[PDB]
C-alpha cells in the first residue's frame, strides 16, 4: 500500500525531470552544481545571462 503509494509520488513533483532526479542527486560537487548551472536552459538556453556565464567561465578558468 504505502510503498506502492510512495512509488507514484515520484513522477509527481514536476514529473521525474528535476523532481525525482533532484531527489536522487540529493540522496564533481558543484562544481557539479555549477555544471547543472550551465544548468537550467529553457526558452533559450536559460542560463548565460548572469549566474550561468559567471560560474561557467570562472570554473573553466
Amino acid at each position: 500500500s504505502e510503498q506502492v503509494e510512495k512509488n507514484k509520488i515520484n513522477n509527481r513533483i514536476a514529473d521525474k525531470a528535476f523532481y525525482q532526479q533532484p531527489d536522487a542527486d540529493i540522496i564533481x560537487x558543484x562544481x557539479x552544481x555549477x555544471x547543472x548551472x550551465x544548468x537550467x536552459x529553457x526558452x533559450x538556453x536559460x542560463x548565460x545571462x548572469x549566474x550561468x556565464x559567471x560560474x561557467x567561465x570562472x570554473x573553466x578558468x
Binding site: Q3, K6, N7, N10, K16, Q20, Q21, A24, D25, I27, X28, X32, X35, X36, X38, X41, X45, X56, X57, X59, X60, X61
Partner: protein, 204 residues
C-alpha cells in the same frame, strides 16, 4: 550471534517465505560481509522499494553478485533502481553506464557527468557524435567534454563540421586551453631564458 555460521541459516529462511522477520536480524549483522546477507538483503530492499538502506546496505560491504542483481532492477518502472541498477552495473567502472543508454535513461543530467571521469577518451566522439543526431544540448556536450584537460581534440571539433556549418559557436573552453597553451608557453619561454641567462655568466 557469535558462534553461528550464518551460512546455514538464511538458507532455512529463504525457502520459508518468511525471511524478512530477520530484517533486523540483518541490522547489527551484515558486518560479516556474508553473501546470503547482501544477496537476499538486496532482493529485500528491491521488492520492498528501499534505496536509502539498499544503497548504504552496499556502501561498504561488496560481497555479492554484481550482475543479475541489476538485472531485476532494470526491469522496473520506478527509476529509483533503474537509476541505481545503472550505477550498480557501472560501479567504479564508468564505461558500462554510458554505453548502455538510448532514448530512455538518457537523462540530460547525470549523462553529462558520468562521462567526465572516463578514460576511453574517444567515447567522447561516441557520445558527441550521438548528441548531434538525437539531441541539441550538444553545447553542454561538446563543452564539458573539453575543459577537462583536453580529450576532445581537433578530430572531434571537426567531425561536427562534415555536417553543421551553422551550430558550433559557444566556447568557454576552447580558450581555456588557449592561454593554457599560452601559459605553459609562458613558463617554458621563462626556463628557456633561464638557460640563456646562465650560459651568460660562466661564459659571457
Amino acid at each position: 550471534s557469535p558462534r553461528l555460521d550464518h551460512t546455514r541459516a538464511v538458507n532455512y529462511f529463504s525457502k520459508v517465505k518468511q525471511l524478512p522477520l530477520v530484517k533486523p536480524y540483518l541490522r547489527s549483522v551484515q558486518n560479516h560481509n556474508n553473501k546470503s546477507v547482501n544477496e537476499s538483503l538486496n532482493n529485500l530492499f528491491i521488492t520492498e522499494e528501499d534505496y536509502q538502506a539498499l544503497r548504504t546496505s552496499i556502501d561498504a560491504y561488496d560481497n555479492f553478485d554484481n550482475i543479475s542483481l541489476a538485472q531485476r532492477l532494470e526491469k522496473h518502472e520506478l527509476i529509483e533502481f533503474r537509476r541505481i541498477a545503472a550505477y550498480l552495473f557501472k560501479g567504479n567502472n564508468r564505461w558500462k553506464q554510458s554505453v548502455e543508454l538510448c532514448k530512455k535513461d538518457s537523462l540530460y543530467k547525470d549523462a553529462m557527468q558520468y562521462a567526465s571521469e572516463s578514460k576511453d577518451t574517444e567515447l567522447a566522439e561516441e557520445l558527441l557524435q550521438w548528441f548531434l543526431q538525437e539531441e541539441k544540448r550538444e553545447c553542454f556536450g561538446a563543452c564539458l567534454f573539453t575543459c577537462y584537460d583536453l580529450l576532445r581534440p581537433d578530430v572531434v571539433l571537426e567531425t561536427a563540421w562534415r555536417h553543421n556549418i551553422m551550430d558550433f559557436a559557444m566556447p568557454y573552453f576552447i580558450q581555456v586551453m588557449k592561454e593554457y597553451l599560452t601559459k605553459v608557453d609562458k613558463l617554458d619561454a621563462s626556463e628557456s631564458l633561464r638557460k640563456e641567462e646562465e650560459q651568460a655568466t660562466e661564459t659571457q
